[PDB]
Amino acid sequence: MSLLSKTRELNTLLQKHKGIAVDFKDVAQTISSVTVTNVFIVSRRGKILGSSLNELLKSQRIIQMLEERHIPSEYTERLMEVKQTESNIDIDNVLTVFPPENRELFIDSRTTIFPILGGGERLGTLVLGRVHDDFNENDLVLGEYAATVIGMEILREKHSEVEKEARDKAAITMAINSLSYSEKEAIEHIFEELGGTEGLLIASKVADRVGITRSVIVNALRKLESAGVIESRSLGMKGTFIKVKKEKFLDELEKS
Amino acid sequence: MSLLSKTRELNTLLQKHKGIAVDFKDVAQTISSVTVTNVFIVSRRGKILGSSLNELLKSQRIIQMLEERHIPSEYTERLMEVKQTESNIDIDNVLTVFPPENRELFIDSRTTIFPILGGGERLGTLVLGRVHDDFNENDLVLGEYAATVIGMEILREKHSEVEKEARDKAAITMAINSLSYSEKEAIEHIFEELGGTEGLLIASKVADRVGITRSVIVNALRKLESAGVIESRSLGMKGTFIKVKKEKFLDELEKS
Amino acid sequence: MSLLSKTRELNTLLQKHKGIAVDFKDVAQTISSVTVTNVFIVSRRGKILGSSLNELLKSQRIIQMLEERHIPSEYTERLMEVKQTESNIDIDNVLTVFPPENRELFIDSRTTIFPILGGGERLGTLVLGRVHDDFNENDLVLGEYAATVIGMEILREKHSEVEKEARDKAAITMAINSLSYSEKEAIEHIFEELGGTEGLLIASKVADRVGITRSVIVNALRKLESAGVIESRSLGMKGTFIKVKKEKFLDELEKS
Amino acid sequence: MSLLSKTRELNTLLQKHKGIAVDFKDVAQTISSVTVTNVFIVSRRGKILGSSLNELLKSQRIIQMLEERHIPSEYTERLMEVKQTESNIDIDNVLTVFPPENRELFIDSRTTIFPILGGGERLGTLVLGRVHDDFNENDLVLGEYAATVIGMEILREKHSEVEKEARDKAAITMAINSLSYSEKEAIEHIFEELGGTEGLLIASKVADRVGITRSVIVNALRKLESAGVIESRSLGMKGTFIKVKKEKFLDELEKS
DNA sequence: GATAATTTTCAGAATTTTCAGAAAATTTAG
DNA sequence: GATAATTTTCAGAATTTTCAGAAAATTTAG
Ligand SMILES: Nc1nc2c(ncn2[C@@H]2O[C@H](COP(=O)(O)OP(=O)(O)OP(=O)(O)O)[C@@H](O)[C@H]2O)c(=O)[nH]1
Ligand SMILES: Nc1nc2c(ncn2[C@@H]2O[C@H](COP(=O)(O)OP(=O)(O)OP(=O)(O)O)[C@@H](O)[C@H]2O)c(=O)[nH]1
Ligand SMILES: Nc1nc2c(ncn2[C@@H]2O[C@H](COP(=O)(O)OP(=O)(O)OP(=O)(O)O)[C@@H](O)[C@H]2O)c(=O)[nH]1
Ligand SMILES: Nc1nc2c(ncn2[C@@H]2O[C@H](COP(=O)(O)OP(=O)(O)OP(=O)(O)O)[C@@H](O)[C@H]2O)c(=O)[nH]1
Ligand SMILES: CC[C@H](C)[C@H](N)C(=O)O
Ligand SMILES: CC[C@H](C)[C@H](N)C(=O)O
Ligand SMILES: CC[C@H](C)[C@H](N)C(=O)O
Ligand SMILES: CC[C@H](C)[C@H](N)C(=O)O
């Protein structure tokens, strides 16, 4: 099986995965097939995001490591020292992925470490190990496709979660500014009587006890409703039902 | 220059690009440098998302294509019928990326087509062109790997686009439900006289033409600001400035 | 000389330094006196912030390192691996501060590495080396006073520069919001004709060419003057003299 | 517990505190834990910046001191006369930190005084108290090193305080120069009727009492907002809300 | 000393704005 | 079907606000 067929095999997993997310465990399996290696996709903090082992599964430490979803904290930082792709690493090296204890079974073992880069920084590490054979250039080509692609699926993940928080801050800010002076004070006193995420209270009485017009309170709520900060429904004599959908709202209110 | 050298060059563009969006015009010329080819990155409908050419620029048609940001209609169809990679296409084949009229300069021209796939569907096509040298398998490895990542960035963009159009619909609806009856009527008329995405008008004047209280207009606008549907700016004696941040708002409002 | 007298010596340098800043070179000298060692105060990126060497000055690499204001980039990252105070490190170790080349002169050499911590993260490293003798606990007490104190003078420096940028953003924002719609457009057209940091222009003519009232322009400038964004003086027939004192102002204006 | 163990404990509080400001109440009890002492951190004028006591809390006077956040006037003087560290002070010496009346519980009490020095001047005093055990030299090493860092955090705070009062003066002056003659007159009267740091008043009413155009008042307030001297809030029919962010503004204005 | 050129100041109207409160509309329980 | 309890809607006045522009004030050159 030629390199083209191996690259074609890997590139097919990505071109046909439904959705946008790519399962790194699926990737780990594919990387093992076309190269016959034990695969480890670890984070910058060592969290195991993918794995496709066989010979290593035969070690006690490795089993307890897969359950921890982590790797030796000390060995995690040593992978950070590899800034370029270092291949063909024997068992007599510190960067070997195989247990130095069971050296007899892994005497001819060779280890290669690919760094995962994205957006201009370090994102993870892709460690591949073999029991005897060595790594050639055709293997480093396949491994660098993975690191470059994994870093892209991580760069998207980190970026998408930043966009989410950035929108919530805008939604809260977009709402806090649309409030009037009397409407900010109204919202402060309501969330006080409400106490929790959702509840039921009589807005009118809260308006009378505090000395704020009743329509000023209805006005503030409808603005927060428009901004997606809360959901509200009327219950007539029972009162007004409120369900906060953005918790950080109040915290940013007094801050204003 | 070995394949592992060309591969490392391409991956470097992707791992260090700032932000998240990868510019296809950068990819195209990067693909062109490492393979010594004329590069086209086109969509299903033949829009040139990115290109980096040299010899082809000595043809009249190629220039007007770049001006139109599109490729011929006839050619776009025949690219869709290419369901797999097809390399070393001669000048006399319809799938050739070189103008046949300039045969004196393109008689020994070879052109390979790489379908761009993402999420299991055809997103576009990556076309490479050479004047003399044929395409080896080490070239198909790059072109196929570049079409893969190109499909990944398109898959991602189309997803973020859909998420945004959905967040917008939600913003409009959430803001329309916040409007009372008289408030919902003012906005219909305010946005009628505005005539465009943004403008300046005298609200109190429009309030008297229809017979709605001016206070109604002020509160309604302030509720659309809470949902990020419009930006509003008071110019006192000169009127009110209104910039709409959601095209489809007015259309959606009329539905109700 | 007892430890109390050594601690008293060090604590005097800090209690009597005039001003708020503490010169790390002065510190380097004091740390060398009370312990008789070659002192290195390096950053997280290896930048030498202080030094008090003697025996090492006798090496060619060290001389070229002091001029670079840096240390071997590779050795800089290895110091990051020391998370706790590691002392009594022989020349046969990678973390030795002495040149492994001139091993014969530094055979009994012992090296100690103190990490500089502040605010909850790593800030630098304090490396001490000896030619023969070893380190005791009384030496680690003195070295940890230094690391803890150096980290405090660095935490203050980093914090003070953050407070400075945070105020400039507020000054610009505090000003951009106080501007009216017509006053923002006025400031946009003035900085256009101005071209550079400071210059001379006739505001009236700029007002007439663009179609904005002349007093609207005087009003915008006086607000920016109040916010410290610009300095302005009148020159009657010659025009108005403007000197921008905050460059990022305009960049944040169109962004609004 | 060795000195190097006690030292490492204190440094840990300083290296991991969040922000920049170190809370002296944390330092005091930390000093108390590692040396088994009653701790007082007082200024020149005897204000208890921080304390952590146990046995002393069984005395009436000590409690009222904590309530007053001050120490006796007579005792504060005698601490200033202590120009150097003085350890193992008996119960019958005026420099004792223990109430003589409770002699039955404090007859074998020992108390050491550590002057707190920063920038070459006396900033405060660190006082430690014990019921039985005397103070060794390993204790003077901690108390002297704690007084040093305490002096460092006071030196820093007093500097940031002065920089702020200077930035304020600049903000006031810069804002006053931005005011015209009629504008400068309105603010004098507006701030006269306000009577306090913040309040609500009817500007247009105050405009007619004096005979100034209402527009003048609006623009003047908007110029003080640009310099961060006040916050202003429009309440329409109810009036204008004004919060002053710079106490000394009104005073400084009257000077002109 | 005075003209000429901008630059500021000041005054005033039109519009925008926030709040009050009475009438309308709703929900819940009967 | 109807009372009672809040909840919304709507209308209206008082105040705040932004802009225009004419008169005043300033600087520069003579
Ligand atoms: N698409 C995709 N992304 C993944 C997968 N596994 C992990 N990630 C992403 O990888 C990113 C980093 O991994 P973390 O969950 O943060 O693990 P960690 O222990 O916190 O390590 P650090 O990210 O370095 O802090 C996360 O934001 C995930 O979105 C996966 O299987 N598929
Ligand atoms: N990252 C990135 N995406 C791009 C670039 N140019 C185009 N795209 C994406 O390519 C996709 C198609 O480009 P369009 O310009 O919309 O072309 P089209 O005619 O709509 O193409 P069809 O998808 O066939 O309908 C969209 O998802 C774009 O976001 C580029 O330079 N960078
Ligand atoms: N008080 C004081 N601070 C210093 C001294 N030398 C350096 N610093 C501070 O140490 C901080 C970090 O050093 P840098 O100038 O940033 O050196 P660098 O090469 O950029 O290394 P990094 O800070 O890790 O990025 C700076 O912000 C300085 O303010 C000194 O002699 N006295
Ligand atoms: N970091 C820090 N500084 C503090 C703390 N308590 C007081 N200070 C500083 O200690 C100094 C004096 O405290 P004050 O409360 O002003 O006492 P004082 O009576 O003015 O003292 P004198 O300086 O003698 O006039 C000031 O610079 C304060 O900022 C604290 O808990 N943490
Ligand atoms: C997978 C980690 C490997 C075994 C590494 N050599 C260690 O001992 O931690
Ligand atoms: C890019 C278009 C190519 C050259 C096509 N064969 C044509 O003749 O138009
Ligand atoms: C000061 C650096 C020392 C000599 C280190 N062992 C190196 O060789 O880089
Ligand atoms: C803290 C004050 C001490 C106890 C002082 N000697 C007194 O008697 O008041």
Author numbering:
A (entry chain B), B (entry chain A), C (entry chain B), D (entry chain A): 1 to 256
Cite, word for word, the article reporting this structure:
In Gram-positive pathogens such as Staphylococcus aureus (Sa) and Enterococcus faecalis (Ef), the pleiotropic transcription factor CodY plays a key role in integrating metabolism and virulence factor expression. CodY DNA-binding is activated by two types of ligands: branched chain amino acids (BCAAs, i.e. isoleucine, leucine, and valine) and, in most cases, guanosine triphosphate, GTP. Each 30 kDa protomer comprises the N-terminal ligand-binding domain called GAF (cGMP-specific phosphodiesterases, adenylyl cyclases and FhlA). The GAF domain is connected by an extended linker helix to the C-terminal DNA-binding (DBD) domain that contains a winged helix-turn-helix (wHTH) motif.
The crystal structure of the SaCodY–DNA complex—also presented below—had Ile/GTP-bound GAF domains. The SaCodY-DNA complex was co-crystallized with Ile and GTP. The Ile/GTP-bound GAF domains of SaCodY in its free and DNA-bound forms are essentially identical, demonstrating that the GAF domains do not undergo a structural change upon DBD domain-DNA interaction. In the crystals, two CodY dimers bind to a single DNA duplex. The dimers are related by a 60° rotation and a 30-Å translation along the DNA, binding one side of the DNA helix. The spatial relationship of the two dimers of SaCodY is defined by a crystallographic axis. DNA interactions are primarily mediated by hydrogen bonds of residues with the sugar–phosphate backbone of the DNA, indicative of an indirect or shape readout mechanism. What follows is a detailed description of the interactions between protomer B of SaCodY and the 5′ half-site DNA. The position of the recognition helix in the major groove is stabilized by hydrogen bonds of recognition helix residues Thr213 and Arg222 to backbone phosphates of T5, T6 and T17’ located on opposite sides of the major groove (the prime-sign indicates template strand nt). Ser215, located at the recognition helix N-terminus, forms the only base-specific hydrogen bond between the recognition helix and major groove bases.
